[PDB]
Design a protein around this ligand. Sequence first.
Ligand SMILES: CCCCCCCCCCCCCC(=O)OC[C@H](COP(=O)(O)OCC(O)COP(=O)(O)OC[C@@H](COC(=O)CCCCCCCCCCCCC)OC(=O)CCCCCCCCCCCCC)OC(=O)CCCCCCCCCCCCC
Ligand code: BCL
Ligand code: BCL
Ligand SMILES: CC[C@H]1c2cc3[nH]c4c(c3C)C(=O)[C@H](C(=O)OC)c4c3nc(cc4[nH]c(cc(n2)[C@@H]1C)c(C(C)=O)c4C)[C@@H](C)[C@@H]3CCC(=O)OC/C=C(\C)CCC[C@H](C)CCC[C@H](C)CCCC(C)C
Ligand SMILES: CC[C@H]1c2cc3[nH]c4c(c3C)C(=O)[C@H](C(=O)OC)c4c3nc(cc4[nH]c(cc(n2)[C@@H]1C)c(C(C)=O)c4C)[C@@H](C)[C@@H]3CCC(=O)OC/C=C(\C)CCC[C@H](C)CCC[C@H](C)CCCC(C)C
Ligand SMILES: *[C@H]1O[C@H](CO)[C@@H](O[C@@H]2O[C@@H](C)[C@H](O)[C@@H](O)[C@H]2O)[C@H](O)[C@@H]1O[C@H]1O[C@H](C(=O)O)[C@@H](O[C@H]2O[C@H](CO)[C@@H](O)[C@H](O)[C@H]2NC(C)=O)[C@H](OC(C)=O)[C@H]1OC(C)=O
Ligand SMILES: *[C@H]1O[C@H](CO)[C@@H](O[C@@H]2O[C@@H](C)[C@H](O)[C@@H](O)[C@H]2O)[C@H](O)[C@@H]1O[C@H]1O[C@H](C(=O)O)[C@@H](O[C@H]2O[C@H](CO)[C@@H](O)[C@H](O)[C@H]2NC(C)=O)[C@H](OC(C)=O)[C@H]1OC(C)=O
Ligand SMILES: COC(C)(C)C/C=C/C(C)=C/C=C/C(C=O)=C/C=C/C(C)=C/C=C/C=C(C)/C=C/C=C(\C)CC/C=C(C)/C=C/C=C(\C)C(=O)O
Ligand SMILES: COC(C)(C)C/C=C/C(C)=C/C=C/C(C=O)=C/C=C/C(C)=C/C=C/C=C(C)/C=C/C=C(\C)CC/C=C(C)/C=C/C=C(\C)C(=O)O
Ligand SMILES: COC(C)(C)C/C=C/C(C)=C/C=C/C(C)=C/C=C/C(C)=C/C=C\C=C(C)\C=C\C=C(C)\C=C\C=C(C)\C=C\CC(C)(C)OC
Ligand SMILES: CCCCCCCCCCCCO[C@@H]1O[C@H](CO)[C@@H](O[C@H]2O[C@H](CO)[C@@H](O)[C@H](O)[C@H]2O)[C@H](O)[C@H]1O
Ligand SMILES: [Fe+3]
Lengths: 299, 39, 39, 71, 60, 59, 103, 273, 62, 336
Amino acid sequence: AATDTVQVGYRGTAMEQNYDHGDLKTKFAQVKLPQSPPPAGESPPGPLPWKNVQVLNDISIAEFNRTMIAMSTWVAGTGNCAYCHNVAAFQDDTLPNGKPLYTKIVARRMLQMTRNINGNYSQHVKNTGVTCYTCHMGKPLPNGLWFYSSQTDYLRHYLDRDGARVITQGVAPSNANRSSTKQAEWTYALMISQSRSLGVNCTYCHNTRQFASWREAPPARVTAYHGILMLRDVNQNYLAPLQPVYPAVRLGAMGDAPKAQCVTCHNGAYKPLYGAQMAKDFPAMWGRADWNGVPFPGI
Amino acid sequence: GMTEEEARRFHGYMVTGTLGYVVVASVAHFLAWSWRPWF
Amino acid sequence: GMTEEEARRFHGYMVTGTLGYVVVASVAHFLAWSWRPWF
Amino acid sequence: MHRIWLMYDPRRVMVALVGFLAVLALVIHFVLLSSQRYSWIENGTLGADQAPVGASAPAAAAEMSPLPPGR
Amino acid sequence: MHRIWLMYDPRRVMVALVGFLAVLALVIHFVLLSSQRYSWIENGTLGADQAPVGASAPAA
Amino acid sequence: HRIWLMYDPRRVMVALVGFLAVLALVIHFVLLSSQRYSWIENGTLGADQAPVGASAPAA
Amino acid sequence: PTAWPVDPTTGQTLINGRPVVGRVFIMRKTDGTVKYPNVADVVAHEALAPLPPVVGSSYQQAPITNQRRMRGIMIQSTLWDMDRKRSATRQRYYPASTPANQL
Amino acid sequence: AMLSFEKKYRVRGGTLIGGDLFDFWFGPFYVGFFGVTTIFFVTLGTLLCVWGAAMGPTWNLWQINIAPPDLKYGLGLAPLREGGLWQIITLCALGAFGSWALRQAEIARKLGMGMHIPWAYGGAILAYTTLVVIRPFLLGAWGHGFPYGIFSHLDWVSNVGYQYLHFHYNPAHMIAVTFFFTNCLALAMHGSLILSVTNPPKGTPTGTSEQENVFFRDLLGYSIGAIGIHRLGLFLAVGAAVWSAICIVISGPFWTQGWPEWWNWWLNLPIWK
Amino acid sequence: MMEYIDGAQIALYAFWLFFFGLIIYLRREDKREGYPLESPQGPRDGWPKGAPKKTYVHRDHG
Amino acid sequence: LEYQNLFTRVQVRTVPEPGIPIDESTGTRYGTGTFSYLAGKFGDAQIGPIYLGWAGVLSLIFGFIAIEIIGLNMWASVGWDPVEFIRQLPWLALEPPPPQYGLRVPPLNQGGWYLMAGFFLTVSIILWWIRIYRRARALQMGSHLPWAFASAIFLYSTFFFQPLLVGSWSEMVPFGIFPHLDWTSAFSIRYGNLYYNPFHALSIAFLYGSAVLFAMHGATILAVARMGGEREIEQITDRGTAAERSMLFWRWCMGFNATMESIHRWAWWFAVLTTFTGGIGILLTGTVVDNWYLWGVKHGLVAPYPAQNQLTPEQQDLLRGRYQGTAPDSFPSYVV
Ligand SMILES: CCCCCCCCCCCCCC(=O)OC[C@H](COP(=O)(O)OCC(O)COP(=O)(O)OC[C@@H](COC(=O)CCCCCCCCCCCCC)OC(=O)CCCCCCCCCCCCC)OC(=O)CCCCCCCCCCCCC
Ligand code: BCL
Ligand code: BCL
Ligand SMILES: CC[C@H]1c2cc3[nH]c4c(c3C)C(=O)[C@H](C(=O)OC)c4c3nc(cc4[nH]c(cc(n2)[C@@H]1C)c(C(C)=O)c4C)[C@@H](C)[C@@H]3CCC(=O)OC/C=C(\C)CCC[C@H](C)CCC[C@H](C)CCCC(C)C
Ligand SMILES: CC[C@H]1c2cc3[nH]c4c(c3C)C(=O)[C@H](C(=O)OC)c4c3nc(cc4[nH]c(cc(n2)[C@@H]1C)c(C(C)=O)c4C)[C@@H](C)[C@@H]3CCC(=O)OC/C=C(\C)CCC[C@H](C)CCC[C@H](C)CCCC(C)C
Ligand SMILES: *[C@H]1O[C@H](CO)[C@@H](O[C@@H]2O[C@@H](C)[C@H](O)[C@@H](O)[C@H]2O)[C@H](O)[C@@H]1O[C@H]1O[C@H](C(=O)O)[C@@H](O[C@H]2O[C@H](CO)[C@@H](O)[C@H](O)[C@H]2NC(C)=O)[C@H](OC(C)=O)[C@H]1OC(C)=O
Ligand SMILES: *[C@H]1O[C@H](CO)[C@@H](O[C@@H]2O[C@@H](C)[C@H](O)[C@@H](O)[C@H]2O)[C@H](O)[C@@H]1O[C@H]1O[C@H](C(=O)O)[C@@H](O[C@H]2O[C@H](CO)[C@@H](O)[C@H](O)[C@H]2NC(C)=O)[C@H](OC(C)=O)[C@H]1OC(C)=O
Ligand SMILES: COC(C)(C)C/C=C/C(C)=C/C=C/C(C=O)=C/C=C/C(C)=C/C=C/C=C(C)/C=C/C=C(\C)CC/C=C(C)/C=C/C=C(\C)C(=O)O
Ligand SMILES: COC(C)(C)C/C=C/C(C)=C/C=C/C(C=O)=C/C=C/C(C)=C/C=C/C=C(C)/C=C/C=C(\C)CC/C=C(C)/C=C/C=C(\C)C(=O)O
Ligand SMILES: COC(C)(C)C/C=C/C(C)=C/C=C/C(C)=C/C=C/C(C)=C/C=C\C=C(C)\C=C\C=C(C)\C=C\C=C(C)\C=C\CC(C)(C)OC
Ligand SMILES: CCCCCCCCCCCCO[C@@H]1O[C@H](CO)[C@@H](O[C@H]2O[C@H](CO)[C@@H](O)[C@H](O)[C@H]2O)[C@H](O)[C@H]1O
Ligand SMILES: [Fe+3]
C-alpha cells in the first residue's frame, strides 16, 4: 500500500503524481533487465564497399556493421540478419524467388523516419532521442498500433485532424468560439488517452483550474504539444504510406497501414524506457551533426 | 452457573480438539516446507 | 464479586502466564536473531 | 486455567473460536496466493529451486529513474 | 460428543453448515476458473504437461 | 496484587488479548512491508544476502 | 538593479547613499506571488487565441460497418480501452447490410 | 439576557472537566472549560490566519491563501513562511473543533439531553481530520493537505480530482453524492410537511400528525412517521460526511490509477467476462 | 459598454439583497417563542424585533 | 449504553390500517394498507394505499413512455444483446442531437429519440407537480411542498433553457448513468471551470448547509425524543420542556436559536435555495459568461500562484492551437 508521490506544481495546488510503489518497481525492473547493452564503439578507415545503401551513406564500415548488429537485436533478435536479408546477398531487396524483402524495404524507411524524429523533433525527444528499440522493444510489432475505424476516433488527432481547443480566451461569449460540450467530451477522451499513455494524471501538464493556461501549467505541456506535431509527421509521411509494402496480414480492416500514438514509444512511462539514453551511442540514427556536443564521426 | 465437573470435562474435549488441530497443522506445515521452504 | 482470595489466586495465573509467554517470545527472538540479526 | 470455562458460556466461546481460526486461515491463504513465491495455483508444480525469490538488490542505469523528476 | 446436539439445535446448525459449504465450493471453483493453469472451460482438454505454468525464477 | 479488585478479569483478559493481538499483527505487517524482512518472498536469503538500507555517503 | 550598491570600504550595502548595518535582502511576499491585475494581463502571458475551426464543406456518410452503435462521446476512453470481450467488441459497429438483389 | 423560560435551567453540573470553575455563562453562551479552550484555539488560529494574509500578496478576502508545505518536508514541520504556518493553524483547528464537540457534550449533559449532537458533529470532524491528518499521513507528507483560502482550496479540490482523471467514477464518491442529494430532498419534504400542517390556508384548522402521515404516504408509498424522518435525516446527513471521508481516503493511499479503470472488475465477472 | 459591470455580477448582488432580506425574516420568525428576553436592565428584544407569538386554532372536534 | 432512540424494539400493530379521510372524487385511493416489519423498525410501519387522480395517472403514462424510449435506445445500442445490456448498463446513453442541427428537429437515431424522451419526461414531471399541488389542497395543507418541488423543477428546466439560449440541443444532458457525469465534467471544462461560477459556489453552500441543518435538527430531535420532542406539531402548538431544551442547547452553544416551528423554515429555504441558485448559475453560463475563471480574474476571485512556465513570443504563436472542428469524413490513402 506504499505510495510514492512526485510534486510537479506549487505546494498548495495538489499538482502531484502518485505511484503504487510496488507496482512501479515491477515495471521498472521489467524494463531494466531486458534492456539490450550496446556493443563497443570502433572504427577503422576505408571507402564504402556497399552496392545498395541509400540511407547509411555517411558512416564508416565498422559503424555500419555495428548498426546492423544493433538493428537485429532491437527489431528481430541479436543474430537474426535473416529477418531482413537474403543472407547470401545482403545488397538484394528481393528473395531468390524474386519476391520483395518487404521487411528490408520497411526497415530502410524506418531508418529515414528515425533520423527525421531525432533530427527535426529534438524539441520533443531532446538528447534522449529514439532508436528502433524505443518502439520495437526487441519484437517486430510495437505497441499501440491503430487503424481506421470510425470517423470520430480521437487517434486521428495524430494523423489528419487538427485542433483540440474548446475554451474561450475571454470572459464573454463570442463568435470566435462556438465549441460544443460534446467537443469538450471529445478532447477529454483524447486527454485520458494521453494521460494513460504516459502513466501520469492531468496535473502533469495542466493546472486544472484552467486547462487552457500555459503559464500555470508545467513545462511538460510544451513538450507534449510537440509530440502531437511529431506523430502527425511520422504517421502521414512514414507509417501510413507503407500500405503497399506490407503483407495483407499487417493491414487494417480498411487495408490501411498500422499507425503510431504516444503509447507506442512511452508504453505507460513518463519517458520512454524511463529515460534510458541509447541514441547517443548510435550516430547512424542521429540526423544531427552532434549529440549533446559529441560530434558526428563523419568517416 | 457452570460446574467444575462440566468445566473439567469440557477442557478434555478442548485439549483433544486442539491437539488434533495442531497435529494436522504441523503435518501441513512440514509438507509445505518439503515442497517450498520459506527459510 | 472479588475477594482477596480470588484476587490473589488470579494474580498467580496472570503473573505465571505473562512470564511463560515472555519466555516463549524470548525463544522466538533467539530463533529470529539466529536467522537474520537486526543489529 | 480451566476456570476460563467458568467465565463464559462455552457455546459462545466455540462460536468465537471457530470464527477466529476461519478468518486467520483465510488471511494467511490469500496473502500467500497474492505472493509471487507461493502463487500455488499457477506455479505450484515448480521445483523449490525454480520458485521465485525476492531480489536482494535491483540494478540501475544512471540516466534512468523510475519516478518523473519533481519540484 | 453427541450431547453437543443438546447444546445446539440440529435443525439450525445444518442450515448454517449447508450454506457454508455452498459458499466455499463456489468460491474455490471461481478462483480456479479465473486462473491460467485451471481455466478448464477453455483449456481443460490440454494434457498435464501442456497446461500453463506460472513464470519461473530464472532472470539476469 | 489488589489491582484485580479494581478491574474485572472478564474485561481485563479480553482487553489484554486484544492489545497483544493488535500489537503482534502490527509488528508482523510492518516487518513484512520492509525490504529486509519481507520473509514470504525472501526468507530463504542468507543473512549476508538480505537487504540493508543505504549508508552515510561521506561526500 | 537586482541589488543596492555596495561600499568598497567595508562590503556594506548603501541605500539612498547611506550605509545599512546588516545583510540586505529585497523584501517579497510569500514565494514572490503577485496579484493578477487584469484579464488582459493574464491573457498577455498566454498563447494567442486559437485559430478558427476547420469544418468540412460537405458530409460524406461512412460505410455502415464504420458507424458506431453507441453515440456517447467518451466511451472509447471510459469503456472500450479496458473492455475487450469479443462479443461486446463486435457489437460496437453496425453489421454489414446489402440490398438483396446485390447478394 | 435570557429567554423568558431560561433561568430555571441554568444549574451547575454536567461538566466533563473543570467542575464549578468555569461553569457559568457569558451573555447567551455557556462557557465551561472547553469554552475556554475553544476561545484560545479560535483566537490563536484566527490571528495566525490574519498573519498569513499579511505576509501574502493581498488582503482581498477571496484571494488569501495559506498553503501547506512542499512534499519534500514529509511529516516534519516546515519553515513557518514555507507552510509551517499552515501546520500550526491546523493544530489550532483540530483543537477548536474538538473543544467545540466536548463543549456540546457538556451542554447536552446539563440539559438532560442525549449525546446525539456531539456525535453527529463528529462526522464532520472525521472528514476534516481525514483531509488534513489521515490522508496526508498515509501519503507520508503534510503537504497533501488542502490550503486555507476561500478559492485556493477549490483549486486543490479540482486538481485532486483530476489526479484520478475522472473523479466522478470513484464508487464511494457516487455514494457520498447520492447521500448529499437525497438528504437535501428529504430536508425539503420534512420542512414543507411540518410548515404546511402548522401554517394551513387561512381559515383552515391547524393540521395534525395524521394528515402529515397520510400525505407523506402518498409521496413515498409508506409512512416514515415522526421519529423515523429525524432518524433518516440524521442517517443521510452524517452518512454523506462518512462516505466523503471514505471516498477521499481511498484516493491515493489505496487506489492510484484513474477511477474509470477501477470498474474493470464489474466487466470481468465470470458470468459475462 | 460598461466594462466592469456584467450580468453575472448584477445577478449576484440581486441575490445578496434578497438573501439578507431572507435572514432578517427568518430571525423575526425565530423570536416568536421565548422573547422578549429577561435582563437585569429589563426586557430586551434583540434585533430584528421578533414577530408576535402565534395562537393556534384547534380542530373543532374531529 | 443509554438508550439512543435509533431503533425500536417493540412495535404495535392495529388490526385495521388507516384510510384516506376526505375529498374522494376525480380520483380514488388504490390498494389498501399493509405493514412492513423492516420499515416498522426504521420508522412507521404502514405501507399505504396511494393517490393518483387524473394528473397522477397521466404523469405515469408519459413517464413510462419516456423511460421506455430511454431503455430501448440503450438496449439497441448494444445490438439487443441482453447480457451486454446489463454488463454495460451504466455506460449506455440516449444521446442529444448533433451540434450542427442547432434547434432544428434531428434524425431519429441521431437524437430524435432523445428529444422525444425529453419531452415526455418534462410533461410527466409537470403533471406530477400538479398531482402534488392538488393533493396538498385536498388534505387542507399549505402549498409549501409544491413550491419546494418547483425549485427542483427550475434547475431541471435550465438543462432545457440554457441549451435553447446557446442555440443547440446538442448541449443537453445525455440520459445515462456515467454519460451524464461525462457531460457534467465536460460542461465545467467547456465553460472554464465552474468552481468560479459564484452561483455554483452559492448552490454548494446551500447544499452543504442542508446537510449541516438536517444533521443538527435530526440529532436535536433525537436528543429530546425521550421527552416527546418528535411530536413536533404538539410542541409547536403547546411548547413542552423538549422544545425549551432544544432552544437552550443551541442558544448556549452558538449564541442564538430558532423555534420548533421556525427551524423548519430554515430547513425549507436552505433546500430550496440549493436548486434555485443552481439554476441561475446554469442560465448565466454560456449566455453571459463563457469562461468563469476569467470572470473570476476580472472580479478578483483567483488566488495568484508563481508561474510554472514562461512562453517566449514565438511560442505564444506556435502553441496556440485551433478550435476543434468537424471529424474527418473520409479514410485517406497516403499512396501518393
Ligand atoms: C454563505 C451563505 C450561507 C450563510 C448562512 C449564514 C446564516 C447566519 C444566521 C445567523 C446570523 C444571526 C445571528 C444572531 O442572530 O445572533 C444574535 C444577535 C443578537 O440578537 P438576539 O439574539 O435576538 O438578542 C440577544 C442580544 O440582543 C442581547 O444578548 P446579550 O446581552 O446576552 O449579549 C450581548 C449581545 C451583543 O450583541 C452582539 O454581540 C451581536 C454581534 C453579532 C455579530 C455577528 C452578526 C452576523 C450576521 C450574519 C448574517 C449576514 C451578515 C452579512 O448579544 C450577543 O452576544 C449575541 C451573540 C450572537 C453571536 C452570533 C454569531 C453569528 C456569526 C455568524 C457568522 C456567519 C458568517 C457567514 O443578533 C444580532 O446581533 C443581529 C443579527 C441580525 C440578523 C442578521 C441580518 C443581516 C442582514 C443584513 C444587514 C442588516 C443591517 C440592518
Ligand atoms: C509449580 C512449579 C513451579 C516451578 C518449580 C520448579 C522446580 C521445583 C524446578 C524448576 C526448574 C526450572 N524452572 Mg520451573 N517452576 C515454575 C515455573 C517456571 C516458569 C514459568 C514460565 O512460570 C519458568 C520459565 C521456569 C523455568 C525453570 C528453569 C529455570 C528450570 C529448568 C526446567 C525448565 O526449563 O522448566 C520450564 C518450566 C516449565 C515446563 C513449567 C514448570 C513446571 C515443570 C514441571 C518444570 C520444573 C520441575 C522440574 C522438572 C523438576 C526436576 C527435579 C528437581 C531437579 C529436584 N519455571 C512453577 C511456578 N522449577 C528446576 C531448576 O531449578 O533447575 C535448575 C527445578 O528443579
Ligand atoms: C467537474 C465537475 C464540476 C461540476 C459541474 C456541475 C454542473 C455542470 C452542475 C453542477 C451543479 C451542482 N453542483 Mg457542481 N461540479 C463540480 C464540483 C462540485 C462539488 C465539489 C465538492 O467539488 C460540489 C459539492 C458540487 C455541488 C453541486 C450542487 C450544489 C449543484 C446541484 C444541485 C442539485 O441539487 O442538483 C441535483 C438536483 C437536480 C438535478 C434537480 C432534478 C429535479 C428533477 C425534477 C428530477 C427528475 C426525476 C424524474 C422524475 C425521473 C427521472 C427518470 C430517469 C430519467 C430514468 N459540485 C465541478 C466543478 N455542478 C448544478 C448546478 O446547479 O450548477 C450551477 C449543475 O448543473
Ligand atoms: C456531518 C454532516 C455535516 C455537518 C454537520 C454538523 N456541523 C456542525 C454540527 C453538525 C451536526 C454542529 O453541531 C456544529 C455546530 O455547532 O453547528 C452550529 C457544526 C458546525 N459546522 C460548521 C461548518 C461547516 N460544516 C460543514 C459540513 C458538515 N457539517 C457536514 C456536511 C462545512 C463544510 C462542508 O464546508 C462547514 C463550513 C460550523 C458552523 C459548526 C462548527 C463550529 C466550530 O467548530 O466552532 C469552533 C471553531 C470556530 C468558530 C473557528 C475555528 C477557526 C480556526 C481555529 C482557524 C481557521 C482554520 C480553518 C481550517 C480555515 C479554513 C479556510 C477555508 C476557506 C478552507
Ligand atoms: C429542493 C431540491 C431537492 C429536491 C426536491 C424535491 N424533489 C421532489 C420533491 C421535492 C420537494 C417532490 O415533492 C417530488 C416527489 O414526488 O418526491 C417524492 C420530487 C421528486 N424528486 C425526484 C427525483 C430527484 N430529485 C433530485 C433532487 C432534489 N429534489 C433536490 C436535491 C434528484 C437528483 C439529485 O438528481 C432526483 C433524481 C423524484 C423521485 C420526484 C418526482 C417524481 C416524478 O416526477 O415522477 C414522474 C413520473 C415518472 C418519471 C414515471 C414513472 C413510471 C414508472 C416506471 C411506473 C409505470 C407504471 C405503468 C406502466 C404506467 C401507468 C399505467 C396507468 C394505466 C396507471
Ligand atoms: C530478387 O529480384 C531482384 C530483381 O527482381 C534481384 O535484384 C537484382 O539486383 C539489383 C541490384 C538490380 O537492380 C536488379 O535488376 C536485379 O539485377 C535480386 O537479386 C533478387 O533476384 C532473384 O530473383 C530475381 C527475380 O526477379 O525473379 C531473379 O531474376 C531473374 O529472373 C527474373 C524472372 O524470370 C527475370 O525477370 C530477371 O531478368 C532475371 N535476372 C537475372 C539477373 O537473371 C534472380 O535470378 C538470377 C539468375 O539472378 C534471383 O537472384 C538469383 C541470384 O537467383
Ligand atoms: C478525406 O476527406 C476528408 C474531407 O476533406 C479529409 O478530412 C478533412 O481534413 C481534416 C483536417 C478535417 O478533420 C476534416 O474536417 C476535413 O476538413 C480527410 O482527411 C481525407 O482527406 C483526403 O481527401 C480530401 C478530400 O476531401 O478529397 C483531400 O482534400 C483536398 O481535395 C479536395 C478535393 O480535390 C478539395 O476539396 C480540398 O480542398 C483539398 N483539401 C486540402 C487541404 O488540400 C485531402 O487532400 C489534402 C491535401 O488534404 C486528402 O487528404 C489526404 C492526406 O489524402
Ligand atoms: C502472515 O502474516 C501475518 C498473518 C500477519 C502473520 C501473523 C499471524 C499471527 C499473529 C497469528 C496468530 C495465531 C494464533 C495466536 O494465538 C493462533 C492460535 C490458535 C489457536 C488457539 C487454536 C486452537 C484450536 C482449538 C480447537 C480447534 C479446538 C476444538 C475443540 C473441539 C472441536 C471440541 C468441542 C467440544 C466437544 C466435541 C464436546 C463437548 C462435550 C461436552 C460439553 C459434554 O459432553 O458435556
Ligand atoms: C515495530 O514498530 C513499532 C510498532 C512502532 C515499534 C514499537 C513498539 C511498541 C511501542 C511496543 C510496545 C510493547 C508493549 C508495551 O507495553 C508490550 C507489552 C506486552 C505485555 C503486557 C504482554 C503480556 C502478556 C500476558 C499474557 C499473554 C498473559 C497470559 C495469561 C494466561 C495464559 C493465564 C490466564 C489466566 C486465567 C485464565 C485465569 C484462571 C483463573 C481464574 C479465572 C480464577 O482463579 O478465578
Ligand atoms: C423493455 O423495457 C426496458 C427493459 C427497456 C425497460 C428498462 C429501461 C431502463 C433500464 C432504463 C434506464 C434508464 C436510465 C439508466 C436512465 C438514466 C438517466 C439519467 C441518469 C439522466 C440524467 C440526466 C438527464 C437530464 C438532466 C435530462 C434533461 C432533459 C431535458 C430537460 C429535456 C427536455 C426536452 C424537451 C422539453 C423537449 C421538447 C420537444 C421539442 C423541443 C421538440 O418541442 C418543444
Ligand atoms: C464445535 C463446533 C460447534 C458449532 C460451531 C458453530 C460455529 C458457527 C460460526 C462461528 C463463526 C461466526 O463468526 C463469528 O460470529 C461471532 C458471533 O458472535 C462474532 O462475534 C461478534 O459479533 C457478533 C455479531 O456478529 C456480536 O453479537 C458478538 O457480541 C461479537 O463477539 C465473531 O466476530 C465472528 O467471527
Ligand atoms: Fe422536525
